[PDB]
Design a protein around this ligand. Structure first.
Ligand code: 9TW
Length: 209
């Protein structure tokens, strides 16, 4: 049972512009997704301060980076607050319509593309490097769901029958054929050190056989 949704026009426009604009500084996608994971971890930590049972679904607060050269995927896993089905449909818990408008207005006023995260829509920078993005998420108040989009104006949501995650979000980047540098250990390490060196949660870069 798969549900197919249209992106709001403004979000489809932002994704088309991310996909089609010439812009060499693609590595910022990883900073943006790690920052999103850190924000989601902050949220579940705050909730746990007054309700410890919020961590019954998992006490560890961390971020894992999992490259897979056979699948040509880079997966960013966090154990943050996760998203409900309603969150996924509502632009993955973002105010993407007004954020896109502000990002657009800022670019006309002299902001840089790398500033996308200041406008709450840093997630969509994934499409700088990914032809398809799958988001697996589990929120304490809902079931496990899979969101997926190859852009082109639509996304899908289905119940996820795969590996239970407990709580958190898994962003699976199906990389473009010419973007496989982001599967190399030394390249990922360089980007994390350059852009994410002060994130307040452990970031573990997995290695491969
Ligand atoms: N207008 C642009 O060239 C532009 C604006 C925002 C973006 F995220 C990108 Cl990649 C390009």
């Amino acid at each position: 049972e798969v549900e197919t949704f249209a992106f709001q026009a403004e979000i489809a426009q932002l994704m088309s512009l991310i996909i089609n604009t010439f812009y060499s500084n693609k590595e910022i996608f990883l900073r943006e997704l790690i920052s999103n994971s850190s924000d989601a971890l902050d949220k579940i930590r705050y909730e746990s301060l007054t309700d410890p049972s919020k961590l019954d679904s998992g006490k560890e607060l961390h971020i894992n980076l999992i490259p897979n050269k056979q699948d040509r995927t880079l997966t960013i896993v966090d154990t943050g607050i996760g998203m409900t089905k309603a969150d996924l449909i509502n632009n993955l818990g973002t105010i993407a319509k007004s954020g896109t408008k502000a990002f657009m207005e800022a670019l006309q006023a002299g902001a840089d593309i790398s500033m996308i995260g200041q406008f709450g829509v840093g997630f969509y920078s994934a499409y700088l490097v990914a032809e398809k993005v799958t988001v697996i998420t589990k929120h304490n108040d809902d079931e496990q769901y899979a969101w997926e989009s190859s852009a082109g104006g639509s996304f899908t949501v289905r119940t996820d029958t795969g590996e239970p995650m407990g709580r958190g979000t898994k962003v699976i980047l199906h990389l473009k054929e010419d973007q496989t540098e982001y599967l190399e250990e030394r390249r990922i390490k360089e980007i994390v050190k350059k852009h994410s060196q002060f994130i307040g949660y452990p970031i573990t870069l997995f290695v491969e056989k």
